[PDB]
Amino acid sequence: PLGSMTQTFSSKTEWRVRAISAANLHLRTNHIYVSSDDIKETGYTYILPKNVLKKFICISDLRAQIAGYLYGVSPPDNPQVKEIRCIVMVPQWGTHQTVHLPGQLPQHEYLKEMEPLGWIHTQPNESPQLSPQDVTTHAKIMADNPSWDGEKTIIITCSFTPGSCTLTAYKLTPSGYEWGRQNTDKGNNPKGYLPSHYERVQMLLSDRFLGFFMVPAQSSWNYNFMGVRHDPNMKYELQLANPKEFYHEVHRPSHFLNFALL
């Protein structure tokens, strides 16, 4: 029946609860874990420093994936171990399944003597299998950039487990690179996607050395609130500085200016 009632609608936006939840991400850096032996020995041991790993966790979002390019070298006489020495944040936006990085790779003088070791990204849920989107994205980067060798570049996923963070690092197989560079299906079960397309590598966290960050020279890296101005063909340059948190003021200018408009 009604005609008996008045109830006016209220607004509740997507980022309010996610921003409040992003402020408590520092408690997960005290509990970081890496998967261990499950026929994972590759021929390359990757060592990730904790300082840039903890910072990469707190500047992230628990649902929107963020990514960072890996750079590093090898110890004096041990070509089998790769020390990750730098993480580069580039203009990006993403969802819960993949990220959207520009076509251009990081290019700077500081990284000229280092070799690219792949990329690292956060994942909402822990997965026993490598993401098929990660298989597709990693292979398409190999196709456009011969700098990335299939036996030297890896995909490190930072899984958001309750109370902690689980790390696991995969690499692509020759069969995975050929299927990834052709894949146009973005679903969770694309066709041709096999567990044969990837194998897991070993990863070790260390405190004996420290890494550094490189962020865009002008604007910042987070574009999830400015996705219109993000373009796959966009060009960018880097600087030697640390990245800002996901919900920093400079990442969402429309929230601050539209509220000020009368």
Binding site: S10, A19, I20, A22, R208, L210, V250
Partner: protein, 1725 residues
């Protein structure tokens, strides 16, 4: 003390505050009646009659006043009734006054008479008088009243040269006001926070008069602030015994006797009470009490009460209606006006076709206000602070001219404007208090001020005041306005916050101090005379007559509350208070103690912007804020759009405060009336609240939260978010274009790349091309450079160069621009270092250098970060990454020389009875260090380096080399170099008794004077000197044998090469290597130093064998050193020093209760304070005179020879202190009592750590910083000073060990651990002092070309370190070709600078040769920059005036500090001189010496110890005068040369060329110079020509004193001149001409030169000058040192033919009146 009991402070709180009605009944005057009306009652009180002139009351005219004060009463013919009864007590007495009179009686002028008496205490004779000698503080209750009286007092006292100004908003540096002003007008809260921040860079100690206007504010909630100000000022009187006059002005209200006792006012002298009858205009009072409870009916009932009373004056009298808000002012003005139209009663306001109806309508046409044009033509108007400034005066000007008939305003007009009206209506007495979160009654001051405007003392016979309020508040306002509302104290509410303020200031250190301080509060006096009102029975008062136990319980309750919130550390048994950094911030930022507890609990480094706002939400200043049901709808519509999310729900008041803060930054006007008031109160206090959070998290090192907090401080001040383009911070720029840029998304940092006509095509505009381009380059921007200088592998020295890349404009930047230098680590989480940088406007285009130290670890980090953020500008930051990828670290220092476990060597090892007799009475055997080097120094000639800690006995090892020199040749010449003059004086005293008194050698001490040093060098076997003192002599070594015939060269404390004056020490020692290699056979060099990490570099530089190098490290000291480094958290220096006072005492009882102790303090003032401090804490434990180990009566033989106040008191209790201000006799008396064991503790300042002849068992270093007077910043102790202070904790034959406690700031704790437990790494800095030495080597022909300059640089220590640590000297490689390039550029730039100053010549870019200007600078040891302007300024007609102004601007005088507490001493000394000056600038370190030079020539003795400033100026004046003499005579100038040659003798005897030449004989007076009236005596030669039995009969002096007069005449230059011209017949023009001049003296060789007013002992120098009249043509000049008989040969050239008459001059540089003048004639053929 006794058993305490905790009280409930809030239970003793008067909740009504200002509305508290202590009196319970109210008696009304005669004739008062009440009427009953429509649900409301009225009360009428008739106007009182003035009391008949009873006593001797005659209105005093201004002509009777003291005349100096008549200028302040321009425009008044006669004082009124109350001012005539006060003028004698105000102008002719210093008594504290308390004046109660009704508002309008004229209390202000009485306060002006008190100010005029103080101004007359510091007046001069030149009309314009000393404004640097006093300060007056006028405390007014309201902001508007302050601003008005600043101009009011400014014009009344403009004829006195007085500056009256209101303090700025926030001036943590912009406090240039106080020192410039003399009358400070402020609010109680303003003067409370300034005196809270108790740094004695203040000017509050200059306050001689404090005026407390409207002191009946004590009854108000703001009352306790007045109690805190008076208690702080009165208690501080007895802690200093400098009287401060207190003047209180009050309304006529009860308890005025208690206010008087609280102000220390004698009732029989300073108490003056006048009732409401003394109101100049009688006031007919009418009160309307409404009883209606419903809001809507009561709203219109009073809307009818206003109109009924408006009509009773409509047309007859103006009516001024007061309302609470600035929105009801228009509604009420309309509710009245619009309702008269219903009754047609507006024609009675104005007379229709009047003369004022046309002026009211016409001024409304150009009124510019819509809610004023609507009401102005009809006679209505409004007034409030939220509208125009010039329309308010339009409202005031019309009402003053009797044009406006109804004016509806608020309390602002009543306070800041003197606008009386016949009828005043207070429409309602209800106001909304956002602090209390509810509606409440108006304050008592607002009511008294509003009704005080009723009745014009000009036209009106009486005044009619109408007050409308609730019926329940009738008894209150009847008491307030009829002198029956008692003034009570609201102090127990704010007791915790105000006790902590005294704890932070140091005025209260324990509970007993707090009980004493509480006894000065107005609360205490009220508790004594009315204990019932303050919860005190008679079961308590007379069992505690002075309420001593009651005060202790209150203090005990407040201390526990502060201890629970971690502001204070309160020990219940001792009652002692310990200040904290958190407690200081709450005090200095005016934050209640409950708020800083919340900040301490919730502030975390991992805090986001979301929780940061929430922490601000929980401030206890908002404890009363609630969420009303009528606001939750408008607030929830904002919560769904806030940019910073809020976690708490809408109903909790925390969320309401959060949304109101974000809305204020977004500039959103809201509709809720309470919300707008609550938003204002939340953000009016958000400024200091967030500023406190910033200081908390910055001083903790939290880098991320500091950035967020500092940004929020600016987002609140600028009212804008970060994401908004920062161009809107220019208010002259319009919102217009900044969103024209904001909508088109591109970074603001890109518009710098564009230009005028291209910024516009971006934002689609060809109009304002240069406008945006102008403000883009007006935005502050700094560019950062970095020179990384590694010290070790864990300490990095950084030189940050700040280059401004913007343009200044006082319209935008003002006088300064503040920045925060932040050095963050790799992860941008920890602030490794931070300091405050301020860009002054005068240096807005120069580069700024900043030096600091940061730690590093040897898995080298990727990079650190340096951020320079603006302190007020938003989006204003430059971060410079400092990569460590190419940083070359120096190698780890080699291990020390192992201390071989040798057998202790006896004194018999010397095997010389004379030698052994110097040590066998002191110690049995040598220490393990002296035994290792014995064979290498005593039985060898190889160069030896001995590096050992301070106190290792290195002085004897140097004596080992001296004793060997005397064995190989009884005539041995040894030069001992020590860096500090204080050390040279001590070593000379010790070595004069050993080598000269016992073994009969010659020990000399260089004086810094050439005429004496060159001869002491030749006749002495041991020469003691300082670096610069030996640099002057060893330069001319090629022409002096006594410099190169050295047998042994000893340099002590050679680790001071890395110090400030290091390069001079490095130059002289490296010269000794060059001389010894070029000479026949080598000269022995022995080097002593503290433990050096790179000791092998000094050995290789000084040519010491590896086996002869003894590099010991601090772990091998003979007496074990127990070092303790306590860290202190407090960043405020004065508050940190307080936190160290008690720990200083506690360290004494723990480490050395019985054995002597030395405490080092940063300043002279701190010596006396810490000594007193140590005493009373020793007295608090009931242990007085425990530091006195001699009986009390065996000290007066030493104790009455003193001249100090407290030094006698402290020495009687076993504690002394040393500082520069004490006389040399006083220091010896304190040092003797300390070493004799009498007194156990002595407190010495840092400046004396090099000249102290005592040693203790424990050395306490209280703080490691001192204040620099020039740069106005604190300076860290040099590491060499700390090493020297620690070395005083060494008594080898008295204590088994040595202990030292170092108290420092936490940021310096790790620095001292790395440079005290390990050896010290020293570097060179000669590359920054190359010019003065390169010039000397070119004059002496050591450097003849550019290749020779590189060869000279290779002998230095500067070069050895350029390969061990290249980055310290800006080098990217230790390559050999890298060194030549660096050495060459250092050579090229140094030789080019000397050639630009015309000091040297450069031919074919290779060869260099010295010029005459360079030969003079090197001869007299003068900076090349000084001698450059020593040719720009001098000329041919210079004389005694131009000379002094030139020599004062020398670079050698840009070192002594400046005191601007002196500025008016020099203001008058600029005319105490008989010699005129033109330029102002009295901070100039050269002009202050120009007056100081003439102060010496005027015998103006006593300058506290500025006397020593002159003594160091005279130490360089002679060499500067002789420089001009050479410069002027070289240019052929006769008069300025001769005038300068007799200024040398003017500064020698401290006189002029005008005074008689008899002021030289001792005990001569400047008065009985004219006692030689016409007796024929004005030369010294006349005094000896009279008989001995006669000549004592005119001076009238002692037979003790004429022997001093005789000693001078026995040494007065008695001579005999004989001159001849060789071959005065055959003279052709252009041929060799020669004139010899023989000078035969009598005897002389009788000591040096008699000059008691000169510090040094000079030798008689002489000049032989030939000239030609005063044509200013000097033709010959020669210097000579006469001993008895000596001739001088002068050659010149003959000019043309004819007959020229030449003049011969024989002048000296010491005595006046001995300048001979002979005349001869030459016939040239």
């Amino acid at each position: 003390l006794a058993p305490r009991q905790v009280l409930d402070l809030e239970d003793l709180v008067f909740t009504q505050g200002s509305h508290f009605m202590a009196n319970k009944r109210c008696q009304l005057p005669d004739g008062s009646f009440r009427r009953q009306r429509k649900g409301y009652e009225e009360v009428h009180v008739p106007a009182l009659k003035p009391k008949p002139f009873g006593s001797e009351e005659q209105l005093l005219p201004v002509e009777k006043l003291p005349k100096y004060a008549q200028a302040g009463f321009e425009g008044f013919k006669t004082l009124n009734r109350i001012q005539s009864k006060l003028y004698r007590a105000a102008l002719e007495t210093d008594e504290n006054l308390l004046l109660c009179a009704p508002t309008g009686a004229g209390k202000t002028n009485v306060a002006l008479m008190c100010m005029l008496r103080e101004i007359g205490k510091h007046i001069n004779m030149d009309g314009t008088i000393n404004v640097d000698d006093f300060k007056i503080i006028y405390i007014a209750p309201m902001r508007s009243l302050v601003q008005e009286m600043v101009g009011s007092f400014g014009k009344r006292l403009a004829t006195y040269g007085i500056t009256v100004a209101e303090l700025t908003g926030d001036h943590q540096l912009c406090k240039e006001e106080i020192s410039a002003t003399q009358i400070i007008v402020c609010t109680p809260e303003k003067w409370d926070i300034i005196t809270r921040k108790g740094g004695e860079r203040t000017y509050t100690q200059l306050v001689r008069l404090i005026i407390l206007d409207e002191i009946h504010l004590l009854h108000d909630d703001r009352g306790p602030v007045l109690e805190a100000l008076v208690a702080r000022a009165i208690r501080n009187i007895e802690m200093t015994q400098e009287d401060v006059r207190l003047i209180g002005l009050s309304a006529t209200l009860p308890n005025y006797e208690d206010v008087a006792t609280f102000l220390r006012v004698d009732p029989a002298k300073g108490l003056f009470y006048f009732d409401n009858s003394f109101r100049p205009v009688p006031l007919e009072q009418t009160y309307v009490g409404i009883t209606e409870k419903k809001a809507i009916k009561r709203f219109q009932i009073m809307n009818e009460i206003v109109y009924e009373k408006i009509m009773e004056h409509a047309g007859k009298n103006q009516v001024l209606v007061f309302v609470h808000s600035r929105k009801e002012t228009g509604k009420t003005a309309r509710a009245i006006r619009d309702m008269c139209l219903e009754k047609d009663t507006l024609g009675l306001f104005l007379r229709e076709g009047s003369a004022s109806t046309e002026v009211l309508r016409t001024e409304a046409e150009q009124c510019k206000n819509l809610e004023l044009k609507d009401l102005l033509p009809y006679g209505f108007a409004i007034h409030h602070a939220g509208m125009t400034r010039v329309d308010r005066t339009l409202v005031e000007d019309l009402f003053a001219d009797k044009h406006i008939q109804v004016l509806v305003s608020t309390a602002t007009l009543a306070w800041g404007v003197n606008l009386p009206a016949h009828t005043v209506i207070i429409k309602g007495t209800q106001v909304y208090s956002p602090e209390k979160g509810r509606w409440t009654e108006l304050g008592a001051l607002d009511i008294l001020q509003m009704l005080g405007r009723a009745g014009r003392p000009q036209y009106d016979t009486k005044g009619e005041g109408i007050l409308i309020t609730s019926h329940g508040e009738l008894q209150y306002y009847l008491s307030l306005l009829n002198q029956q509302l008692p003034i009570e104290s609201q102090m127990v509410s704010k007791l915790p916050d105000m006790l902590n303020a005294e704890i932070v200031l140091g005025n209260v250190q324990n509970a007993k101090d707090a009980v004493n301080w509480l006894g000065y509060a107005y609360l205490y006096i009220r508790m004594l005379r009315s204990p019932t009102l303050y919860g005190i029975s008679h079961d308590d008062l007379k069992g505690d007559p002075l309420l001593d136990q009651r005060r202790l319980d209150l203090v005990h309750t407040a201390a526990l509350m502060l201890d629970k919130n971690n502001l204070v550390k309160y020990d219940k048994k001792t009652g002692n208070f310990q200040v904290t950094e958190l407690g200081r911030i709450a005090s200095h930022y005016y934050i209640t103690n409950d708020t800083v507890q919340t900040y301490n609990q919730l502030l975390k480094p991992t805090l986001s912007e979301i929780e940061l706002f929430r922490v601000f939400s929980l401030s206890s200043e908002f404890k009363n804020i609630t969420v009303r049901e009528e606001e939750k709808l408008e607030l929830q519509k904002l919560l769904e759009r806030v940019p910073i999310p809020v976690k708490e729900s809408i109903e909790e008041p925390s969320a309401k405060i959060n949304v109101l803060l974000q809305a204020f930054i977004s500039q959103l006007k809201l509709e809720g009336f309470a919300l707008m008031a609550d938003m204002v109160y939340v953000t009016q206090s958000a400024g200091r609240l967030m500023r406190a959070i910033f200081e908390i998290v910055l001083n903790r090192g939290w880098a991320q939260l500091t950035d967020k907090t500092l940004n929020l401080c600016k987002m609140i001040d600028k009212r804008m978010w970060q994401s908004m383009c920062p161009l809107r911070q220019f208010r002259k720029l319009p919102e217009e274009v900044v969103k024209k840029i904001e909508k088109k998304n591109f970074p603001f940092e890109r518009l710098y790349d564009l230009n005028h006509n291209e910024i516009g095509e971006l934002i689609r505009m060809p109009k304002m091309g240069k406008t945006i381009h102008k403000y883009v380059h007006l935005f502050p921007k700094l560019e950062l450079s970095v020179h990384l200088q590694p010290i070790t592998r864990s300490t990095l020295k950084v030189e940050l160069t700040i280059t401004p890349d913007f343009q200044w404009d006082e319209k935008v930047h003002g006088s300064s621009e503040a920045f925060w230098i932040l050095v963050e680590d790799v992860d941008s989480e920890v602030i490794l270092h931070h300091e405050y940088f301020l860009l002054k406007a005068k240096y807005a285009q120069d580069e700024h250098l900043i030096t600091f130290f940061v730690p590093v670890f040897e898995p080298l980090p990727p990079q650190y970060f340096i951020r320079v953020v603006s302190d007020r500008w938003l989006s204003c930051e430059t971060q410079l990454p400092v990569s460590f990828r190419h940083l070359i670290l120096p190698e780890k220092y080699p291990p020390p020389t192992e201390l071989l476990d040798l057998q202790p060597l006896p004194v018999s090892a010397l095997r010389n009875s004379a030698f052994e007799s110097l040590y066998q009475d002191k110690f049995p055997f040598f220490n393990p260090i002296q035994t290792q080097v014995f064979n290498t120094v005593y039985n060898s000639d190889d160069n030896v380096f001995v590096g050992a800690p301070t106190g290792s006995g290195k002085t004897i090892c140097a004596e080992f080399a001296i004793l060997r020199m005397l064995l190989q040749s009884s005539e041995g010449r040894c030069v001992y170099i020590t860096p500090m003059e204080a050390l040279a004086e001590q070593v000379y005293m010790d070595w004069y008794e050993k080598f000269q008194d016992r073994l009969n050698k010659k020990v000399v001490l260089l004086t810094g004077e050439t005429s004496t040093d060159l001869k002491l060098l030749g006749k002495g076997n041991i020469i003691i000197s300082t670096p610069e003192k030996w640099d002057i002599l060893s330069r001319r070594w090629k022409q002096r044998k006594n410099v190169q015939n050295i047998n042994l060269f000893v340099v002590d404390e050679v680790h001071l090469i890395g110090g400030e004056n290091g390069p001079v020490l490095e130059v002289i020692c490296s010269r000794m290597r060059y001389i010894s290699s070029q000479i026949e056979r080598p000269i022995r060099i022995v080097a002593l130093s503290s433990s050096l990490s790179n000791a092998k570099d000094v050995a290789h530089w000084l040519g010491c064998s590896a086996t002869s190098t003894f590099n010991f490290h601090p772990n091998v000291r003979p007496v074990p050193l127990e070092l303790h480094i306590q860290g202190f958290n407090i960043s405020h220096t004065q508050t940190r020093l307080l936190s160290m006072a008690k720990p200083v005492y506690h360290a004494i009882t723990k480490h050395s209760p019985k054995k002597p102790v030395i405490v080092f303090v940063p300043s002279r003032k701190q010596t006396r304070l810490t000594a007193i401090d140590i005493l009373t804490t020793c007295a608090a434990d009931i242990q007085r005179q425990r530091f006195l180990h001699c009986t009390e009566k065996d000290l007066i033989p030493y104790l009455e020879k003193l001249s100090d106040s407290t030094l006698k008191e402290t020495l009687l209790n076993g504690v002394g202190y040393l500082h520069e201000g004490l006389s040399p006799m006083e220091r010896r008396l304190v040092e003797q009592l300390f070493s004799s064991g009498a007194i156990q503790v002595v407190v010495a300042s840092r400046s004396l750590c090099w000249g102290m002849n005592v040693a203790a068992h424990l050395v306490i270093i209280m703080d490691t910083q001192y204040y620099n007077g020039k740069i106005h910043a604190y300076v860290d102790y040099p590491i060499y000073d700390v090493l020297q202070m620690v070395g005083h904790a060494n008594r080898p034959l008295q204590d088994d060990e040595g202990r030292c406690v170092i108290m420092c700031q936490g940021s310096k704790k790790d620095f001292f651990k790395k440079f005290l437990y390990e050896p010290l790494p020293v570097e060179s800095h000669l590359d920054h002092c190359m010019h003065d030495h390169f010039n000397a080597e070119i004059v002496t022909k050591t450097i003849e070309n550019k290749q020779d300059a590189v060869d000279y640089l290779t002998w230095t220590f500067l070069y050895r370190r350029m390969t061990q640590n290249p980055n310290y000297y800006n080098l990217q490689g230790i390559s050999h070709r890298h060194l030549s390039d660096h050495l060459s550029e250092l050579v090229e730039q140094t030789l080019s600078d000397l050639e630009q100053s015309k000091c040297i010549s450069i031919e074919d870019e290779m060869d260099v040769a010295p010029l005459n200007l360079g030969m003079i600078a090197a001869y007299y040891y003068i900076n090349y920059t000084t001698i450059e302007l020593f040719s720009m300024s001098l000329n041919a007609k210079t004389k005694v005036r131009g000379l002094i102004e030139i020599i004062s601007n020398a670079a050698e005088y840009e070192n002594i500090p400046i005191r601007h507490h002196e500025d008016n001493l020099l203001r008058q000394l600029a005319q105490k001189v008989p010699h005129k000056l033109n330029n102002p600038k009295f901070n100039d370190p050269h002009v202050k010496t120009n007056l100081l030079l003439q102060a010496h020539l005027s015998r103006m003795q006593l300058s506290a110890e500025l006397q020593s400033d002159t003594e160091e100026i005279l130490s360089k004046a002679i060499r500067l005068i002789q420089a001009c003499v050479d410069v002027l005579s070289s240019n052929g100038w006769l008069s300025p040369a001769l005038a300068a040659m007799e200024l040398a003798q003017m500064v020698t005897q401290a006189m002029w060329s005008k005074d008689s030449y008899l002021k030289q004989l001792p005990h001569f007076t400047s008065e009985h110079i004219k006692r030689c009236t016409d007796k024929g005596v004005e030369s010294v030669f006349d005094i000896m020509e009279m008989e001995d039995e006669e000549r004592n009969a005119l001076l009238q002096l002692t037979d003790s004193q004429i022997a001093d007069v005789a000693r001078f005449c026995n040494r007065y230059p008695n001579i005999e001149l004989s001159y001849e011209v060789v071959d005065k017949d055959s003279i052709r023009s252009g041929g060799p001409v020669v004139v010899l001049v023989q000078l035969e003296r009598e005897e002389e060789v009788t000591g040096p030169v008699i000059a008691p007013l000169f510090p040094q002992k000079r030798e008689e120098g002489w000049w032989v000058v030939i000239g030609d009249a005063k044509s200013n043509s000097l033709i010959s000049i020669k210097r000579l040192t006469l001993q008895q008989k000596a001739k001088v040969k002068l050659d010149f050239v003959a000019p043309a033919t004819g007959a020229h008459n030449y003049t011969l001059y024989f002048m000296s540089d010491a005595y006046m009146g001995c300048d001979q003048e002979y005349k001869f004639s030459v016939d040239v053929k």
